[PDB]
Design a protein around this ligand. Structure first.
Ligand SMILES: CN(CCOc1ccc(C[C@@H]2SC(=O)NC2=O)cc1)c1ccccn1
Ligand SMILES: CC1=C(/C=C/C(C)=C\C=C\C(C)=C\C(=O)O)C(C)(C)CCC1
Lengths: 272, 16, 232, 10
């Protein structure tokens, strides 16, 4: 399209991105560094500390969704699941703000969410991570990488791959306006298994890609081949998702009472 | 497959 | 010439097809082996192409200049993707099937009557038809394959940085190539790059199967492949 | 990896 258009699209996306996602990379980064005086995240680095961060909600109001009694490893696993349930909702809302998306075949809309959701969650998860940990619960806590990595049986390495991706991803130093465009690019992927009408989708992603390139050229002039490097991450995300799915099969085989949240079972069924 | 819950979110959105 | 000259990448592709002669021995005239199972034919073709893949790697500018142990790491990490991309593209000519390097034409249902459906159906929809619909040329496939070869995240690599820089050298050449040759389509470069996610997830599911063939065996498989197939 | 390696240095 035309420049003025690509820039408007960029601005449109950024705004609904601010509207749909509470802890932006900006706010996130604000916390992991030092900015904003009000409350530093409560650091969870071991069993007792988890307890303190957890049972803090015990003082706090009773919302939770698995108040212990069930081993450390599983409480954290179920916590990620619930955070993911929130995320799919924030993501679904953003998707609806992307021009021409709700005008697509309803079955194609769901397929895009089905395969795009986890790729986005892992992309945005990076915004909340540094080399030592990830912010949790709207940034009220900070769970260390060493603690997650020490979990028992198969849970010991369910986050380590995400951290590794985050390290390289953050190396591109994108900001929320860059991310807002990229996420949309991910959602509007014409290669998802099972799509009925590709043409409409690729036509929309085509414009989003042009917007992203311009956005990156203007917002990152000295960053060379950033556009290409960023699209390459789309293949990495693909791997983190199949790898996590494989890890899910394992848990299912070694954990007697697995049980996955309904919205998640819905997404993981017949996936890739 | 169906994905009934995704449909809900797409159609009506998220409640409080 | 210019770090990553597009002309040599095409040459590496050209220099190691197919191309006459080969497209006849296993689909019209005689044929060795004489097996009665269709997953076997693809594994045979894969093994054969593994030797050629090394030949190709040496022709891509700067590969053979890298440290020998790094060369090994890269080919062990990208062989299945590099290979899938080759036969996927070679199969544009055919409607709903694949063309192996040993001259064998594998058909859809055959893939089904072997329990390798879907994974085979994804190749036709997610790879072959896409390359066909946008008509990616041999130069573009060569560069995409080169981008894949030079993967910096391959565990164990001695100096990741220098591999990423080669991959960037490739990104630049491809982009220049696309603009010069395909000025009418500005987003062709991104489109070529967005062929890689499907190659990636498809390649991973392919390795999942191969290890669901090693553990059980029964009339096992060719060497070198078994050598590649010892996980990274 | 014998094969892959042998083929790389000739
Ligand atoms: C380690 N953190 C940060 C969040 O980190 C996440 C890790 C993985 C996911 C994906 C989920 S997990 C699964 O199996 N399936 C999914 O969709 C989502 C978020 C915790 C841990 C406990 C409580 C809250 N936050
Ligand atoms: C596609 C495919 C599979 C594996 C293929 C691999 C790893 C390489 C193929 C290379 C070829 C076919 C090269 C050539 O002939 O040039 C498996 C067996 C899991 C099942 C059926 C679908």
């Amino acid at each position: 399209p035309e420049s003025a258009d690509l820039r408007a699209l960029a601005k449109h996306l950024y705004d609904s991105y601010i509207k749909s996602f509470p802890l932006t990379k900006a706010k996130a980064r604000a916390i992991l560094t030092g900015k904003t005086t009000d409350k530093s995240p409560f650091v969870i680095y071991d069993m007792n500390s988890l307890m303190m961060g957890e049972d803090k909600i015990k003082f706090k109001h009773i919302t939770p969704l698995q108040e212990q009694s069930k081993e450390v490893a599983i409480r954290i696993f179920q916590g990620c699941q619930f955070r993911s349930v929130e995320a799919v909702q924030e993501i679904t809302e953003y998707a609806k703000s992307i021009p021409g998306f709700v005008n697509l075949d309803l079955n194609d809309q769901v397929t895009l969410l089905k395969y795009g959701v986890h790729e986005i969650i892992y992309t945005m998860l990076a915004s909340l991570m540094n080399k030592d940990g990830v912010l949790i619960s709207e940034g009220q806590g900070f769970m260390t990488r060493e603690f997650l990595k020490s979990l028992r049986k198969p849970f010991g390495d369910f986050m380590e791959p995400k951290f590794e991706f985050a390290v390289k991803f953050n190396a591109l130093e994108l900001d929320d306006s860059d991310l807002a465009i990229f996420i949309a690019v991910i959602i509007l992927s014409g290669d998802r298994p099972g799509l009925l009408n590709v043409k409409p989708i690729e036509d929309i992603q085509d414009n989003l890609l042009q917007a992203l390139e311009l956005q990156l050229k203007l917002n990152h002039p000295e960053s060379s081949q950033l556009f290409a490097k960023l699209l390459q991450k789309m293949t990495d995300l693909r791997q983190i998702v199949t790898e996590h799915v494989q890890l899910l099969q394992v848990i299912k085989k070694t954990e007697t009472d697995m049980s996955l949240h309904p919205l998640l079972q819905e997404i993981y069924k017949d996936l890739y | 497959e169906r994905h009934k819950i995704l449909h809900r979110l797409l159609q009506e959105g998220s409640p409080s | 010439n210019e770090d990553m000259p597009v002309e040599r990448i095409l040459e590496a592709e050209l220099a190691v097809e197919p191309k006459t002669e080969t497209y006849v021995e296993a689909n019209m005239g005689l044929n060795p082996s004489s097996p009665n199972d269709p997953v076997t034919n693809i594994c045979q073709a894969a093994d054969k192409q593994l030797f050629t893949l090394v030949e190709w790697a040496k022709r891509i500018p700067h590969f053979s200049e890298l440290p020998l142990d790094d060369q090994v790491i890269l080919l062990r990490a990208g062989w299945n993707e590099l290979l899938i991309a080759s036969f996927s593209h070679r199969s544009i000519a055919v409607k709903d099937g694949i063309l192996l390097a040993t001259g064998l034409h594998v058909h859809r249902n055959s893939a089904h009557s072997a329990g390798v459906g879907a994974i085979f159906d994804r190749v036709l929809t997610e790879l072959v038809s896409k390359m066909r619909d946008m008509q990616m040329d041999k130069t573009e496939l060569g560069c995409l394959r080169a981008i894949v070869l030079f993967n910096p995240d391959s565990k164990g690599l001695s100096n990741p940085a220098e591999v990423e820089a080669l991959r960037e050298k490739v990104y630049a050449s491809l982009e220049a190539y696309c603009k010069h040759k395909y000025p009418e389509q500005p987003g062709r470069f991104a489109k070529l790059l967005l062929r890689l996610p499907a190659l990636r997830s498809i390649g991973l599911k392919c390795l999942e199967h191969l290890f669901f063939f090693k553990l059980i065996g029964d009339t096992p498989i060719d060497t070198f492949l078994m050598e590649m197939l010892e996980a990274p």
